[PDB]
């Protein structure tokens, strides 16, 4: 188990860790989060009490360094930093534990939710989507735009997701216009899986990270990318059986985890109806279809 200590909590803030959150009061004696499972990426995120706009947070992996949070009163946010001095860190952590100034990452042992949401998410891939190579962790916020959004402005602050565009020369073979537009299997299997992503695991990882950014930060660009990656699979007649089964599990846990009151802002009616009822794969997402129907029958 690993720990992310906090120097202090000078401003009142709701702090998220993965799918958990707790409220911290102005200058409450808070010094961080302990018992964080090793082996998964994690995200630690903040929504200030006094200005819920600009949700921000940090993607990190405890195996890649010792990280802590410290409030910056000049830039006005909780910043993640890496501590290079190892004995300084353990000492800080151990003192804060002894004083029990840390919340415990509250993982129910039956519960595989986080694993199931991050199964294919690797830090190395996150850092290629979020470019900032001097830090081992990644900042993402609610307002950050995607490379594709910037096409249709500040490039350094972009989410460099893989651009998917169904009416693009990348998607459409000359001479197979109708074929490729109505059955995206070429685009999925040759262009994206074989060409760009190299395998389904990297494709799923980006999809899962886009969903998590969309739900946790309220990032519109991330919501768009998640739906595009789902639609490219549902709109392909020819998808490996193992991808189809895994997709059903992936989406299941995403829909299961989504707040019930955010359906209006985080789910695209057209995509889900197409994907569940009209697409080639209308019959291949039994678990996702089941949960979508019992939990969001209004959207449909």
């Amino acid at each position: 188990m690993n720990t992310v200590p906090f120097t202090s909590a000078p401003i009142e803030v709701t702090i998220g860790i993965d799918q958990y959150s707790f409220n911290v009061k102005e200058n409450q004696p808070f010094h961080g989060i302990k018992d964080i499972p090793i082996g998964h990426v994690h995200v630690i995120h903040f929504q200030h009490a006094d200005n819920s706009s600009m949700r921000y947070g940090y993607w990190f992996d405890c195996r890649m360094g010792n990280f802590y949070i410290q409030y910056d009163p000049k830039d006005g946010l909780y910043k993640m930093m890496e501590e290079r001095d190892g004995a300084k860190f353990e000492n800080i952590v151990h003192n804060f534990k002894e004083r029990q100034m840390m919340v415990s990452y509250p993982k129910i042992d039956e519960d595989d939710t986080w694993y199931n949401l991050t199964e294919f998410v690797q830090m190395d891939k996150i850092r290629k989507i979020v470019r900032k190579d001097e830090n081992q962790f990644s900042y993402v916020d609610s307002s950050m735009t995607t490379v594709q959004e910037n096409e249709l402005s500040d490039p350094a602050h972009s989410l460099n997701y893989t651009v998917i565009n169904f009416k693009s020369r990348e998607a459409i073979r000359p001479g197979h216009e109708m074929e490729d537009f109505l059955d995206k299997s070429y685009y999925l299997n040759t262009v994206m899986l074989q060409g760009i992503f190299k395998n389904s695991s990297n494709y799923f990882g980006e999809l899962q990270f886009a969903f998590l950014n969309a739900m946790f930060f309220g990032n519109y660009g991330s919501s768009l990318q998640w739906h595009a990656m789902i639609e490219l699979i549902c709109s392909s007649a020819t998808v490996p059986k193992h991808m189809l089964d895994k997709l059903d599990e992936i989406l299941y846990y995403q829909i299961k985890t989504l707040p019930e009151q955010y359906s209006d802002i985080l789910l695209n009616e057209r995509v889900w109806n197409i994907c569940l009822y009209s697409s080639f794969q209308k019959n291949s997402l039994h678990n996702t279809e089941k949960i979508m129907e019992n939990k969001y029958p209004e959207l449909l």
Partner: protein, 237 residues
Amino acid sequence: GAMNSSNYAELFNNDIKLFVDDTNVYRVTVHKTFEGNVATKAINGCIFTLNPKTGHLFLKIIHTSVWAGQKRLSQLAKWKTAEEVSALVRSLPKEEQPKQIIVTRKAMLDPLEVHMLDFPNIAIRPTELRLPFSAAMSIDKLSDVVMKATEPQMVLFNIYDDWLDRISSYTAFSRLTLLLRALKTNEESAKMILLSDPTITIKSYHLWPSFTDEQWITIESQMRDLILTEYGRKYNV
């Protein structure tokens, strides 16, 4: 964006544009099979691609052989339309290629957009106007050349005959659409109006009769009356 009553004069400006109508591309007679089931039999069709300013009509004839062994033909017809329009554009010199293509039916937007990816600067637009180009096969010479074709074929016409020597494009388009609207609403009466006078003939190289200016005003009046008449007969007004 979309084209409508408000931006109606844009059609006659000096930016090259084309209307594409696909309503006569896939044409069938539905009939009964010996077993009492229903089968379709296709007949030749055509893409109606029209420059509204110049009157130049690119009449691509769609021979029934293009459908042989194909499924979901109404869907295919939109993509074959789009394939053939794209090929026309590619065949034209650069300075003749359109800057905009307006489809008369919104179901052509995606097929045409996808076929024209090589031409990002050519705007593909729908229209809110209900244009009567479906009635093009009521023009005898157009119907004739389509039905006689034995192979794929492009035929070029000026749908305005020589009208632009005497009237503007705006007026020539309004006349064309009134004629077509009347042929669409009551083909028989419309054709009776255009030919009632044996002394007014159609030039070998024209589609419509050689009316003087005064005779055209009379003709146009009679076409309006017919359209209003049929509106009462239909609606009982």
